[PDB]
């Protein structure tokens, strides 16, 4: 009688063991991706293009009469250019005159790979537009395709509807 219970516990824990191992593979892959993105932000021209995009997308989502851009101190020269470009593009697209300032007193922690945060005039609304947040957001939304690519498709799934 007790032998049956022992077999159940061994098989059930064995299933969890392999599932945890698969979750470690995903975790390690995401950590490697973060290191690869760190290598990207070490660039200059490619990173400035990312900043041009990130600032524009932040501004378009917040749509406030006044905005403050907060960034890592070492990235200020590049963000300055990104804001100067984002402003005339924003105004044309939205037809709203928004005063966009950069925060020169507070800066993002230097351990963040890169990206920006966008605050409204009273600093009560913030846009989580850093690179690490965007990567985590996309990695989860696209995760079903990661599963299949790495470990194979579900052989028992016949209808995708």
């Amino acid at each position: 009688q007790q032998k049956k219970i022992q077999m159940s516990n061994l098989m059930n824990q064995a299933r969890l063991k392999v599932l945890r191992a698969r979750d470690d593979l995903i975790t390690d892959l995401l950590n490697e991706a973060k290191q690869r993105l760190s290598k990207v932000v070490k660039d200059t021209t490619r990173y400035q293009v990312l900043l041009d995009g990130l600032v524009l997308q932040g501004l378009y989502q917040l749509l406030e009469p006044r905005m403050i851009v907060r960034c890592r101190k070492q990235d200020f020269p590049l963000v300055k250019a990104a804001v100067q470009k984002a402003i005339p593009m924003y105004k044309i697209a939205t037809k709203k005159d928004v005063d966009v300032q950069i925060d020169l007193e507070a800066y993002l922690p230097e351990d963040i790979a890169g990206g920006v945060e966008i605050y409204n005039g009273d600093r009560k609304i913030k846009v989580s537009n850093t690179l690490e947040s965007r990567l985590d957001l996309i990695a989860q939304q696209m995760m079903p395709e990661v599963r299949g690519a790495l470990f194979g498709a579900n052989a028992n799934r016949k209808f995708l509807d």
Binding site: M7, R123, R134, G148, N156, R157
Partner: protein, 459 residues
């Protein structure tokens, strides 16, 4: 995917019980999921119930204690509640929110489904056919469950509805004259019973084919509402996309109904009949009717909702509104329980409207229908004779009456009484039936054709 950075708001207009009222929110959605961060670093989840312009109203899943109107931040996801589903999640145990509580990893999704889903297009619905045997004779040889029907277990409070539900999960399967799974959702379950389900499923080796959702009595009441939707959302994925048959057991729908009333009050809706929302009817149908067979696919979903009857009154809106939209009933009694009969299921008031199609040659055995009808009449007569005996005495009875009393006593002792760990297949249940029927001479078995008797009656 959206690939749009999330907005986090620190603007709070006020907090009122379970609700947090936000301000200056950009294009909020109804039913949007948000996450709160309290000043102590504590995180909470919630869902937007009303969006009146920029005034979004969010119900917090956990308690609202500790939330202020100055520092608490609200992160919006930009989307609604969509459950990650996969085949691998079968064999896992989750809480009401869909999070693992079995020390395993988070589900690695194959897709994301809206838990509310859609109604199944009736043009592609297939009438129920084959049977799914439960292993419990009282509901295999008397009121079997067709492969596609929805038949509830009504019980009074205090009866062993949870022990039977667990037994069905351990024993249920196909007739076998690898493609069968059970999805079990317990709403409002107390800690002692929740442990019972988790441990009993793991120990007996059944977990490989069970997806278990536990929503505890002290868990958020809103999570109790999605719990049955998550269970069915998984069932729909497993059944219709992965070509397999799924048995879904929804335990304590009465506790769900109470959680639904709480949500209605949060919306300041005027209560309807007996305090319940006027839309309780469609809400139960929304859950119950996400089942059955579909054209062109080999999967199926069945349901066995289990409901506690308040004050043991079948008239109460909960069992009344349920039964009105389900196909028959199992009905667990109290007299059989007090007499120490397990399972305590009373065959006379029970009914399975689809049994006519569930059983018969090619699905169970040729004689299934005939044995059931004769046993039912014999039990009904035995009860009638027992009532007579109590008035006229034993000496006033004739031989035929004594045979019915012998059947009545041995029927309950051998056929209905089973034990929680004896698994009686459909063929053993019928053989037990014949052992009781061979008490009577052939001429008294009026409901069994002579051809059936000549084949099965002897030996």
């Amino acid at each position: 995917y959206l690939s749009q950075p999330r907005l986090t708001y620190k603007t709070v207009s006020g907090v009122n019980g379970p609700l947090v009222i936000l301000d200056h929110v950009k294009f909020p959605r109804y039913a949007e999921i948000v996450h709160l961060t309290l000043p102590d670093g504590t995180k909470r989840s919630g869902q937007v119930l009303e969006v009146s312009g920029s005034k979004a109203v969010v119900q917090v899943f956990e308690g609202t204690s500790g939330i202020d109107a100055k520092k608490t931040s609200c992160e919006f996801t930009g989307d609604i509640l969509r459950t990650p589903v996969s085949e691998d999640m079968l064999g896992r145990v989750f809480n009401g929110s869909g999070k693992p509580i079995d020390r395993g990893p988070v589900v690695l999704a194959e897709d994301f489904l809206d838990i509310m889903g859609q109604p199944i297009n009736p043009q592609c619905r297939i009438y129920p056919e084959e049977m799914i045997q439960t292993g419990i004779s009282a509901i295999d040889g008397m009121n079997s469950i067709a492969r596609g029907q929805k038949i509830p277990i009504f019980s009074a409070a205090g009866l062993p509805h949870n022990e039977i539900a667990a037994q069905i999960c351990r024993q249920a399967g196909l007739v076998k004259k690898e493609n069968f799974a059970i999805v079990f959702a317990a709403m409002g379950v107390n800690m002692e019973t929740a442990r019972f389900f988790k441990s009993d499923f793991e120990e007996n080796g059944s977990m490989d084919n069970v997806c278990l959702f536990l929503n505890l009595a002290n868990d958020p009441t809103i999570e109790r509402i999605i719990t049955p939707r998550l269970a069915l959302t998984t069932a729909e994925f497993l059944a219709y996309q992965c070509e397999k048959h799924v048995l879904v057991i929804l335990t304590d729908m009465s506790s769900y109904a109470e959680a639904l009333r709480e949500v209605s009050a949060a919306r300041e809706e005027v209560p309807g009949r007996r305090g319940f929302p006027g839309y309780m009817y469609t809400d139960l149908a929304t859950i119950y009717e996400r089942a059955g067979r579909v054209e062109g696919r080999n999967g199926s979903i069945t349901q066995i909702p289990i409901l506690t009857m308040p004050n043991d009154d079948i008239t109460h809106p909960i069992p009344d509104l349920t039964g009105y939209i389900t196909e028959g009933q199992i009905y667990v009694d109290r007299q059989l329980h007090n007499r120490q009969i397990y399972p305590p299921i009373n065959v006379l008031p029970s009914l399975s409207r689809l049994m006519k199609s569930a059983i018969g040659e090619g699905m169970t055995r040729k004689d299934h229908a005939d044995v059931s009808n004769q046993l039912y009449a014999c039990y009904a007569i035995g009860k009638d004779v027992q009532a007579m005996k109590a008035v006229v005495g034993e000496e006033a009875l004739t031989s035929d009456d004594l045979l019915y009393l012998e059947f009545l006593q041995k029927f309950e002792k051998n056929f209905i009484t089973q034990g929680p760990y004896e698994n009686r297949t459909v063929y053993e249940t019928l053989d037990i039936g014949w052992q009781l029927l061979r008490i009577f001479p052939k001429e008294m078995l009026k409901r069994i054709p002579q051809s059936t008797l000549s084949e099965f009656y002897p030996r």
